[PDB]
Design a protein around this ligand. Structure first.
Ligand SMILES: O=P(O)(O)Oc1c2c(c(OP(=O)(O)O)c3c1[C@H]1C[C@@H]3c3cc4c(cc31)[C@H]1C[C@@H]4c3ccccc31)[C@H]1C[C@@H]2c2cc3c(cc21)[C@H]1C[C@@H]3c2ccccc21
Lengths: 547, 543
């Protein structure tokens, strides 16, 4: 007979989270006062940021300096590149702590990220915002949606998703009880972070770590001040040592070491396509030495489009496109750099764009809150955009309609640029600039279906895309033809501004693996599940009844 | 309108494994189906769309128990055919992807019902004769697990359509679970026809198009499941039936710019060769191809002195010798304590004599038949010669092998006095159960031995009625077995109960038969629709 109080039961835990509300920062608001004081508390001060392995904070000979993008005179952080000895020590110390961390129940791990998210919401919000602004050159709203809202939502929703996952259990028929155990991957996970979002840095390190993995985290050299802050918040959130290792390093050096290590089980990358593709080839050449097949997750690229139909709300189009193309200097994977305008609407859209372009204030985001966006991140990115700006002057099929000038005397300041391309296949319409350069193509209204195919076929990427129409039949047909042209599709909204739980972010084609961070299924890449079958009756005869 | 949409739930149950006793209608139906292969040989073409293509590279599949009987004639797809099959698949992909999940699932549900009802006897017989399976090993494979693979994946795919993001006004958010852009390459092994059906069936179900290379030595059975799907309503050019040379199929699909997936089950070094081939050709792919590999298997039966001794012998005989131990889940390591070993040796070798090896189509008393082909047989003979020749290896039972009429290996039990001997840590795919003997004093050092012996981590069994050591063994052998079994055999993973797969060198552990497997064959798109004008580009805080 079967036990009334025994293995007949099954208990499932849930968690009812909410998106962190986005503060207004209006004149007289206490978050404005708190952020402004936090900004003045970062002025002459350069924070000494060590390579934290366990609790032992190590300094090396390869000392590097993070500067403010809008003021490359003032250095905001002193840090150092971890060498092969420190990276191999970080790996071996992490594996030693992995099995204990993995055996820890999901609720105990989730609580560390929940309490990290709560102090991120309240008393340490102004700190992380200010450090992102002076560190990466964000305005207050760009840092509020990033370092606050998205990072908090990443820690809360991924916690939520990880406890509902434990509830996903298989069917049990007697005499066997079946349970799925959601183990972390066996080994260490390499987390590599981009400059443009501190939240992404927190997700790529935090999400694997949440699932019972150990993480060697290399943050971006130009996002270091804010990246060490979110690391420090996680350590006094109650994260044990050797679970996330703060190991800044030279890109190639980090890449070479973690892909030559026998204990690599995952790479959580966000950045450029060729460096992700290089790591992919490295793990393939070294595939014989690994214990487990390493799981590579990459979010890269984005040559994203705003498609406009003649029926569109023209005022929403220019508001949306100006925000998408130029917010944080268009240094977003989701950023609109392709505007497809119909001939009929072009004079109205061109006129309104150039008028509103003239009202866009570029300056210091710390001293002038009226600033829309500030400098791009570094001299290498500035040079790249400077060559793209002169390409807009040199190329015959291109015309600069607004902006075009840049000056790196004080900071890496690029004017918001609107380029008209008569050629829809011009390299400026294909290659990612990661700067404030919007390319515009005017199409005849007769050939709007041909243009829809042309949006799909032009670029190698498929991350974000928007269509603007109040006609419902064209958005229906635009949805089906651009089904694979955008992993994040927008009807009458800007191609940027992915909120966790509402718009899980990521695209296919050249834009990456599309593992959809901010959605329920992201965490599944960072668990290698086990299933326990326990039979309670003796088995019986090895032979069958047909013999 | 806007704020409502029809979703769908699907409640499925596992297909019941029938008893096949004398008098039963299923046993008579099977042997009347078996007596329809005895003197026939099916001419199996490559199927591209609705076109049956033949090539000069004509090949044969013989019964492993009677290798003089050609039971299927087929042919290898050349470069020209595979590329034709790729482009034709891509032309069919867009309308197939756009087809709602309910309409796609209805094909596999209908296909499952055919395989369970009027086509059950056919697919069992064709599996037994084609691959050398007994009645029951074909029943849990060609019927049950394949029915379950089609029904449970159909369930999991429509439950997934319900998993939608939160909508905050004035925006409404939906996830569209698209198939992968391009074609998926499905490479099936010989051991399970079900796995072949799943490897090509599952990606397809999620709106992908598939080039399916079945195992040469399982062609008859795998072409028969292909034909179930096609007259169950699967349109042309969704699954292309393309038997081919292994390397050349690997070379062609890894060279195609439209590759977006490899659903592999087979040998570990081949999966790595495809991995290397993809990475070497990574620049010319339109997207990052998703590789799903099910490899490996050097699985263990850890016995503690406090175990049901009769469950240990009954389980390990089944796990290690069923379908001649040619399972990824098959037990090849027996860890028995010194105190209990005289009692188990006596019972292992006793039941070894009662094992009947022979024709499974003719003799239903047969426990297991011949191994799959000549190249599999030569490996086992090398190992049976090694079991004789090695100083640490003592052949307790079995030893001989005869390829007179079929590739017949008698079940070999070996006692190893060295637990790090190649026979402990190299995959056989053949009926060699190798045993180590450990002292009851030195038991938890042996529990940590079984973990670090082999590079694999697929399945594993612990036998003990002491509940304190099974909780201890679950914690020690966490990553040594993807499918852990407490007081049950290492084999017989049922879909929806024991999702099959393991980490380490055993593969990518995507858990086919689990709810998450299908998520490797969907690349989700999220649509946000805002129903009010966006307002000004500048914010309140700026003024
Ligand atoms: O008639 P019930 O008291 O409600 O118990 C049965 C149940 C179930 C039963 O199976 P069914 O859905 O096929 O009818 C049964 C029972 C009763 C009737 C059938 C059954 C079968 C069996 C036993 C009791 C029951 C005894 C003899 C046999 C059995 C196997 C293992 C332990 C105990 C038993 C379901 C539903 C229920 C049940 C309970 C469990 C499980 C499954 C069930 C899972 C999880 C737990 C369990 C314990 C041990 C092994 C497996 C399980």
């Amino acid at each position: 007979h079967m036990t009334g109080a025994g293995l007949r039961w099954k208990h499932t835990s849930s968690l009812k989270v909410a998106n962190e509300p986005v503060l207004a920062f209006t004149q007289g608001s206490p978050e404005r006062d708190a952020l402004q004081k936090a900004l003045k508390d970062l002025k002459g001060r350069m924070e000494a940021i060590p390579c934290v392995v366990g609790d032992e904070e190590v300094w090396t000979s390869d000392v590097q300096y993070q500067v403010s993008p809008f003021n490359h005179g003032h250095k905001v952080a002193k840090f150092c590149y971890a060498d092969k000895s420190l990276l191999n020590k970080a790996i071996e110390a992490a594996l030693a702590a992995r099995k204990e961390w993995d055996l820890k129940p999901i609720a105990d791990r989730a609580q560390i990220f929940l309490k990290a998210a709560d102090m991120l919401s309240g008393p340490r919000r102004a700190e992380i915002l200010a450090k992102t602004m002076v560190g990466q050159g964000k305005t207050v709203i760009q840092a509020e949606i990033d370092a606050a809202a998205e990072l908090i939502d990443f820690f809360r929703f991924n916690a939520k998703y990880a406890v509902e996952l434990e509830g996903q259990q298989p069917i049990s028929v007697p005499p066997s009880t079946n349970s799925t155990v959601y183990r972390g991957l066996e080994g260490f996970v390499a987390a590599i972070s981009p400059f443009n979002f501190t939240a992404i840095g927190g997700n790529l390190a935090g999400a694997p770590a949440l699932m019972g993995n150990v993480v060697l985290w290399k943050p971006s050299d130009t996002a270091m001040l804010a990246s060490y802050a979110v690391y420090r918040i996680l350590r006094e959130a109650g994260l044990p040592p050797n679970i996330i290792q703060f190991v800044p390093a030279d890109g190639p050096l980090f890449g070479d070491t973690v892909t030559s290590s026998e204990h690599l089980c995952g790479i959580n990358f966000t950045g450029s396509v060729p460096t992700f593709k290089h790591l992919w080839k490295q793990v393939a050449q070294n595939l014989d030495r690994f214990h487990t097949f390493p799981r590579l997750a990459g979010e890269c690229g984005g040559k994203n489009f705003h498609f406009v139909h003649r029926s569109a709300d023209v005022e929403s189009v220019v508001s949306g496109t100006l925000r998408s193309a130029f917010e944080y200097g268009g240094q977003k994977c989701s950023a609109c750099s392709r505007l497809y305008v119909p001939h009929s609407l072009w004079p109205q859209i061109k006129g309104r764009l150039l008028e509103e372009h003239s009202r866009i204030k570029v300056g210091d985001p710390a001293e002038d809150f009226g600033t829309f966006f500030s400098a791009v991140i570094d001299a290498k990115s500035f040079a790249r955009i400077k060559k793209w700006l002169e390409h807009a002057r040199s190329s015959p099929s291109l015309t600069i309609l607004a902006g075009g000038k840049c000056d790196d005397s004080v900071g890496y300041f690029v004017e918001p640029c609107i380029v008209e391309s008569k050629d829809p296949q011009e390299p400026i319409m294909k290659e990612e600039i990661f700067g404030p350069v919007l390319s515009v193509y005017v199409y005849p209204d007769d050939k709007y279906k041909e243009t829809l195919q042309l949006v799909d076929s032009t670029t190698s990427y498929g991350l974000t895309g928007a269509v603007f129409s109040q006609d419902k039949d064209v958005v229906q047909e635009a949805t089906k033809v651009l089904r694979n042209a955008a992993g994040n599709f927008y009807i009458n909204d800007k191609s940027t501004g992915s909120i966790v739980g509402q718009q899980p972010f990521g695209g296919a084609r050249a834009s990456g693996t599309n593992d959809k961070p901010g959605g329920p299924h992201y965490i599944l890449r960072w668990t290698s599940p086990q299933v326990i079958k326990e039979t309670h009756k003796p088995l019986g005869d090895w032979s069958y009844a047909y013999m």
